[PDB]
Amino acid sequence: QIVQGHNQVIHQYFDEKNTSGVLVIQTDKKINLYGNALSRANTEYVPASTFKMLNALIGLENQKTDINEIFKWKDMTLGEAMKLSAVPVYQELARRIGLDLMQKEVKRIGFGNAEIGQQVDNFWLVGPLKVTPIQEVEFVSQLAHTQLPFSEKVQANVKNMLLLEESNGYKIFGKTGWAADIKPQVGWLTGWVEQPDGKIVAFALNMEMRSEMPASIRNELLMKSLKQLNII
């Protein structure tokens, strides 16, 4: 039920960037694999800031913050901080949750290897928490469908923080991640497309990064691939 898709064109997209990558697509029926390094789909990597999705769910569910709270620096909300790079709001939230509640929630959700270690404010960037791209697409598909074991309102509020782009009636939700301080570097873009008729198609892009690459390379590869697959 996890099968290589029609991959002759998308494979070349990753080759052209001179790196190894996979794109996992989950529909209501199938999981398909694309890219030039399909073994990445079942390989565990640190989640990097893709973990912000679960951090926000845990923090909101346990009333450690709310969507209107202003975090002092600009000063900003949890939702404003979701899409921003190198902001400490999510480290502060992790400290409020605390190691014990964070580990209990991550174990209850079963996210990746579900190991957070002893440092509550960085385990998603350097380990020991790791997750495969297949696990990430399954997690984000559950979020999109309001099927995670959290409040419906909490799931809706986190989904609203994840809107990336809208065009031509399609909404693209998701979250970037880049673990730059481990070797090799790991890049993520995990999320879903809400098509005009309401159908949901979830994705997880995972690729090796290098320091000279523009951050936009992940979105660039994602959009070209989703177009080739007629998902947008």
mmCIF file of C-alpha atoms in Angstrom:
data_model
loop_
_atom_site.group_PDB
_atom_site.id
_atom_site.type_symbol
_atom_site.label_atom_id
_atom_site.label_comp_id
_atom_site.label_asym_id
_atom_site.label_seq_id
_atom_site.Cartn_x
_atom_site.Cartn_y
_atom_site.Cartn_z
ATOM 1 C CA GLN A 1 0.000 0.000 0.000
ATOM 2 C CA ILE A 2 3.129 2.185 -0.135
ATOM 3 C CA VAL A 3 4.170 2.095 -3.785
ATOM 4 C CA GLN A 4 6.356 4.028 -6.194
ATOM 5 C CA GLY A 5 4.253 6.336 -8.359
ATOM 6 C CA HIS A 6 4.694 7.530 -11.926
ATOM 7 C CA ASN A 7 8.131 8.938 -11.164
ATOM 8 C CA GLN A 8 10.039 9.466 -14.430
ATOM 9 C CA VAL A 9 9.666 13.274 -14.415
ATOM 10 C CA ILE A 10 9.810 14.055 -10.685
ATOM 11 C CA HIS A 11 13.002 11.991 -10.292
ATOM 12 C CA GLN A 12 14.708 14.368 -12.718
ATOM 13 C CA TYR A 13 13.588 17.431 -10.718
ATOM 14 C CA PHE A 14 15.606 16.222 -7.730
ATOM 15 C CA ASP A 15 18.555 15.181 -9.920
ATOM 16 C CA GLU A 16 18.687 18.738 -11.310
ATOM 17 C CA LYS A 17 19.299 20.097 -7.797
ATOM 18 C CA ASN A 18 22.187 17.639 -7.248
ATOM 19 C CA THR A 19 20.790 16.225 -4.028
ATOM 20 C CA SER A 20 18.815 13.264 -2.699
ATOM 21 C CA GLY A 21 15.117 13.656 -1.985
ATOM 22 C CA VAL A 22 11.761 11.944 -1.662
ATOM 23 C CA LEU A 23 8.187 13.179 -1.957
ATOM 24 C CA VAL A 24 5.512 11.116 -0.205
ATOM 25 C CA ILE A 25 1.891 11.667 -1.313
ATOM 26 C CA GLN A 26 -1.048 10.334 0.707
ATOM 27 C CA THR A 27 -4.539 10.343 -0.757
ATOM 28 C CA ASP A 28 -7.632 8.829 0.823
ATOM 29 C CA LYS A 29 -6.672 5.586 -0.975
ATOM 30 C CA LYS A 30 -2.906 5.332 -1.526
ATOM 31 C CA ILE A 31 0.550 6.352 -0.381
ATOM 32 C CA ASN A 32 2.869 6.899 -3.350
ATOM 33 C CA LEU A 33 6.602 7.662 -3.418
ATOM 34 C CA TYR A 34 8.384 10.024 -5.818
ATOM 35 C CA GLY A 35 11.869 11.502 -6.172
ATOM 36 C CA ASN A 36 15.394 10.236 -6.724
ATOM 37 C CA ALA A 37 16.068 8.606 -3.297
ATOM 38 C CA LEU A 38 13.004 6.545 -2.419
ATOM 39 C CA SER A 39 14.681 4.851 0.565
ATOM 40 C CA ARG A 40 14.401 8.179 2.397
ATOM 41 C CA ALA A 41 10.649 7.604 2.783
ATOM 42 C CA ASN A 42 11.190 4.915 5.465
ATOM 43 C CA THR A 43 14.321 6.501 7.009
ATOM 44 C CA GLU A 44 14.111 8.358 10.324
ATOM 45 C CA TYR A 45 15.295 11.990 10.448
ATOM 46 C CA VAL A 46 15.068 14.719 13.043
ATOM 47 C CA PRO A 47 11.817 16.627 12.372
ATOM 48 C CA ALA A 48 13.326 20.110 12.771
ATOM 49 C CA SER A 49 10.622 22.780 12.818
ATOM 50 C CA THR A 50 7.996 20.415 11.409
ATOM 51 C CA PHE A 51 7.678 19.613 15.115
ATOM 52 C CA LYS A 52 6.165 23.090 15.672
ATOM 53 C CA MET A 53 2.837 21.584 14.550
ATOM 54 C CA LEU A 54 2.841 19.083 17.419
ATOM 55 C CA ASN A 55 4.356 21.583 19.886
ATOM 56 C CA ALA A 56 1.448 23.939 19.163
ATOM 57 C CA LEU A 57 -1.157 21.169 19.508
ATOM 58 C CA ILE A 58 0.269 20.081 22.868
ATOM 59 C CA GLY A 59 0.625 23.628 24.177
ATOM 60 C CA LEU A 60 -2.899 24.645 23.195
ATOM 61 C CA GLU A 61 -4.529 21.394 24.349
ATOM 62 C CA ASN A 62 -2.923 21.708 27.791
ATOM 63 C CA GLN A 63 -3.740 25.429 28.101
ATOM 64 C CA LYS A 64 -0.085 26.445 28.321
ATOM 65 C CA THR A 65 -0.856 29.185 25.797
ATOM 66 C CA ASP A 66 -3.713 30.368 23.600
ATOM 67 C CA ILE A 67 -3.975 31.729 20.079
ATOM 68 C CA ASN A 68 -4.245 35.337 21.313
ATOM 69 C CA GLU A 69 -1.249 35.386 23.671
ATOM 70 C CA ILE A 70 1.465 37.893 22.766
ATOM 71 C CA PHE A 71 4.988 36.536 23.217
ATOM 72 C CA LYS A 72 7.435 39.293 24.085
ATOM 73 C CA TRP A 73 10.382 39.816 21.740
ATOM 74 C CA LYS A 74 8.412 41.998 17.210
ATOM 75 C CA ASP A 75 6.048 40.802 19.918
ATOM 76 C CA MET A 76 3.896 38.146 18.283
ATOM 77 C CA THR A 77 1.419 35.293 18.647
ATOM 78 C CA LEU A 78 2.005 31.551 18.351
ATOM 79 C CA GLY A 79 0.380 31.641 14.928
ATOM 80 C CA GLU A 80 2.553 34.495 13.669
ATOM 81 C CA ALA A 81 5.635 32.644 14.931
ATOM 82 C CA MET A 82 4.669 29.372 13.174
ATOM 83 C CA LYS A 83 5.907 30.400 9.739
ATOM 84 C CA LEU A 84 8.857 32.531 10.915
ATOM 85 C CA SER A 85 12.431 31.307 10.967
ATOM 86 C CA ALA A 86 14.754 31.588 13.975
ATOM 87 C CA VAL A 87 12.140 32.789 16.467
ATOM 88 C CA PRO A 88 12.299 31.569 20.110
ATOM 89 C CA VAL A 89 8.523 31.461 20.755
ATOM 90 C CA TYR A 90 8.398 27.691 20.273
ATOM 91 C CA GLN A 91 11.331 27.095 22.625
ATOM 92 C CA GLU A 92 9.494 29.110 25.283
ATOM 93 C CA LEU A 93 6.317 27.088 24.726
ATOM 94 C CA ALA A 94 8.259 23.830 25.015
ATOM 95 C CA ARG A 95 9.670 24.981 28.365
ATOM 96 C CA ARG A 96 6.154 25.807 29.615
ATOM 97 C CA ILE A 97 4.916 22.369 28.584
ATOM 98 C CA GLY A 98 7.902 20.847 30.370
ATOM 99 C CA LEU A 99 9.850 17.679 29.680
ATOM 100 C CA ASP A 100 7.454 15.287 31.407
ATOM 101 C CA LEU A 101 4.218 16.453 29.767
ATOM 102 C CA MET A 102 5.963 16.754 26.401
ATOM 103 C CA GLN A 103 7.270 13.189 26.597
ATOM 104 C CA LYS A 104 3.887 11.843 27.711
ATOM 105 C CA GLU A 105 2.086 13.593 24.836
ATOM 106 C CA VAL A 106 4.646 12.592 22.206
ATOM 107 C CA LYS A 107 4.347 8.978 23.397
ATOM 108 C CA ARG A 108 0.528 9.137 23.348
ATOM 109 C CA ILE A 109 0.567 10.474 19.773
ATOM 110 C CA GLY A 110 3.273 7.977 18.782
ATOM 111 C CA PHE A 111 5.208 10.556 16.745
ATOM 112 C CA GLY A 112 8.270 8.979 15.129
ATOM 113 C CA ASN A 113 10.485 7.153 17.609
ATOM 114 C CA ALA A 114 8.670 9.147 20.340
ATOM 115 C CA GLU A 115 11.971 9.851 22.167
ATOM 116 C CA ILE A 116 12.565 13.404 23.394
ATOM 117 C CA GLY A 117 15.522 12.910 25.716
ATOM 118 C CA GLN A 118 16.261 15.296 28.571
ATOM 119 C CA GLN A 119 16.408 18.732 26.851
ATOM 120 C CA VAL A 120 12.874 19.986 26.239
ATOM 121 C CA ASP A 121 13.824 23.016 24.111
ATOM 122 C CA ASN A 122 15.798 21.490 21.216
ATOM 123 C CA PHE A 123 15.076 17.740 20.867
ATOM 124 C CA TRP A 124 13.389 18.278 17.487
ATOM 125 C CA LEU A 125 16.455 19.956 15.936
ATOM 126 C CA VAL A 126 19.355 17.767 17.081
ATOM 127 C CA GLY A 127 17.698 14.585 18.319
ATOM 128 C CA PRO A 128 16.978 12.234 19.836
ATOM 129 C CA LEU A 129 13.482 12.582 18.301
ATOM 130 C CA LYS A 130 13.363 11.197 14.758
ATOM 131 C CA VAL A 131 10.515 10.469 12.334
ATOM 132 C CA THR A 132 10.193 9.059 8.805
ATOM 133 C CA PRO A 133 8.603 10.953 5.896
ATOM 134 C CA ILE A 134 5.868 8.294 5.753
ATOM 135 C CA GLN A 135 5.126 8.917 9.439
ATOM 136 C CA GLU A 136 5.057 12.681 8.834
ATOM 137 C CA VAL A 137 2.587 12.441 5.955
ATOM 138 C CA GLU A 138 0.340 10.191 8.041
ATOM 139 C CA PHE A 139 0.479 12.640 10.961
ATOM 140 C CA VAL A 140 -0.359 15.655 8.823
ATOM 141 C CA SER A 141 -3.149 13.773 7.039
ATOM 142 C CA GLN A 142 -4.705 13.024 10.426
ATOM 143 C CA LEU A 143 -4.413 16.699 11.383
ATOM 144 C CA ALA A 144 -6.017 17.779 8.096
ATOM 145 C CA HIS A 145 -8.952 15.412 8.740
ATOM 146 C CA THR A 146 -9.289 16.342 12.452
ATOM 147 C CA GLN A 147 -8.420 12.757 13.410
ATOM 148 C CA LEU A 148 -5.618 13.342 15.904
ATOM 149 C CA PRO A 149 -6.504 12.659 19.579
ATOM 150 C CA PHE A 150 -6.788 16.342 20.468
ATOM 151 C CA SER A 151 -9.652 18.804 20.738
ATOM 152 C CA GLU A 152 -11.350 19.592 17.430
ATOM 153 C CA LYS A 153 -10.943 23.325 18.098
ATOM 154 C CA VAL A 154 -7.235 22.911 18.861
ATOM 155 C CA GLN A 155 -6.737 21.028 15.597
ATOM 156 C CA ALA A 156 -8.639 23.712 13.664
ATOM 157 C CA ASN A 157 -6.571 26.463 15.286
ATOM 158 C CA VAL A 158 -3.278 24.792 14.385
ATOM 159 C CA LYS A 159 -4.471 24.119 10.820
ATOM 160 C CA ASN A 160 -5.236 27.828 10.467
ATOM 161 C CA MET A 161 -1.624 28.659 11.370
ATOM 162 C CA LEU A 162 -0.310 26.453 8.546
ATOM 163 C CA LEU A 163 -1.798 28.118 5.468
ATOM 164 C CA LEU A 164 1.096 28.714 3.056
ATOM 165 C CA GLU A 165 -0.407 29.712 -0.295
ATOM 166 C CA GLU A 166 -3.743 29.861 -2.053
ATOM 167 C CA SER A 167 -4.221 29.930 -5.799
ATOM 168 C CA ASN A 168 -6.943 29.095 -8.276
ATOM 169 C CA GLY A 169 -9.194 27.678 -5.541
ATOM 170 C CA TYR A 170 -6.530 25.363 -4.060
ATOM 171 C CA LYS A 171 -5.205 25.925 -0.538
ATOM 172 C CA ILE A 172 -1.751 24.665 0.370
ATOM 173 C CA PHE A 173 -1.066 24.133 4.072
ATOM 174 C CA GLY A 174 2.214 22.986 5.498
ATOM 175 C CA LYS A 175 5.366 23.517 7.481
ATOM 176 C CA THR A 176 9.025 23.805 6.492
ATOM 177 C CA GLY A 177 11.918 22.403 8.479
ATOM 178 C CA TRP A 178 15.677 22.565 8.055
ATOM 179 C CA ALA A 179 18.039 20.857 10.505
ATOM 180 C CA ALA A 180 21.202 22.709 9.562
ATOM 181 C CA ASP A 181 23.394 21.635 12.477
ATOM 182 C CA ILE A 182 23.376 17.891 11.865
ATOM 183 C CA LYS A 183 25.264 16.078 9.143
ATOM 184 C CA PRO A 184 23.967 15.503 6.594
ATOM 185 C CA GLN A 185 21.512 18.398 6.775
ATOM 186 C CA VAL A 186 17.800 17.527 6.494
ATOM 187 C CA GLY A 187 15.104 19.627 4.819
ATOM 188 C CA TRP A 188 11.355 19.117 5.126
ATOM 189 C CA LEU A 189 8.144 20.487 3.710
ATOM 190 C CA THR A 190 5.132 18.612 5.117
ATOM 191 C CA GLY A 191 1.481 19.552 4.683
ATOM 192 C CA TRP A 192 -1.560 19.071 2.500
ATOM 193 C CA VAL A 193 -3.478 20.475 -0.451
ATOM 194 C CA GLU A 194 -7.169 21.246 -0.011
ATOM 195 C CA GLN A 195 -8.506 21.027 -3.554
ATOM 196 C CA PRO A 196 -11.439 23.210 -4.689
ATOM 197 C CA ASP A 197 -14.009 20.436 -4.247
ATOM 198 C CA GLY A 198 -12.769 19.778 -0.698
ATOM 199 C CA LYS A 199 -10.593 16.724 -1.315
ATOM 200 C CA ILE A 200 -7.388 16.558 0.742
ATOM 201 C CA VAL A 201 -4.048 15.320 -0.605
ATOM 202 C CA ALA A 202 -1.247 15.189 1.951
ATOM 203 C CA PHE A 203 2.472 15.461 1.229
ATOM 204 C CA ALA A 204 5.867 15.123 2.883
ATOM 205 C CA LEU A 205 8.956 16.316 1.022
ATOM 206 C CA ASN A 206 12.269 15.297 2.599
ATOM 207 C CA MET A 207 15.662 16.050 1.076
ATOM 208 C CA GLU A 208 19.320 16.527 1.858
ATOM 209 C CA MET A 209 20.128 20.240 2.199
ATOM 210 C CA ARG A 210 23.378 22.131 1.734
ATOM 211 C CA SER A 211 24.176 25.530 3.175
ATOM 212 C CA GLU A 212 24.291 27.331 -0.192
ATOM 213 C CA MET A 213 20.745 26.301 -1.143
ATOM 214 C CA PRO A 214 17.968 28.899 -0.910
ATOM 215 C CA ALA A 215 15.300 28.094 1.654
ATOM 216 C CA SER A 216 12.775 28.293 -1.216
ATOM 217 C CA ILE A 217 14.229 25.169 -2.880
ATOM 218 C CA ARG A 218 11.806 22.956 -0.936
ATOM 219 C CA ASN A 219 8.707 24.856 -2.055
ATOM 220 C CA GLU A 220 10.100 25.059 -5.597
ATOM 221 C CA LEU A 221 10.477 21.284 -5.830
ATOM 222 C CA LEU A 222 7.108 20.687 -4.145
ATOM 223 C CA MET A 223 5.125 22.941 -6.480
ATOM 224 C CA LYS A 224 6.695 21.578 -9.662
ATOM 225 C CA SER A 225 5.963 18.048 -8.464
ATOM 226 C CA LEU A 226 2.368 18.717 -7.386
ATOM 227 C CA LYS A 227 1.715 20.271 -10.802
ATOM 228 C CA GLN A 228 3.208 17.267 -12.606
ATOM 229 C CA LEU A 229 0.913 15.004 -10.545
ATOM 230 C CA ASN A 230 -2.130 17.245 -11.214
ATOM 231 C CA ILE A 231 -2.640 17.726 -7.477
ATOM 232 C CA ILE A 232 -2.739 21.479 -8.089
#
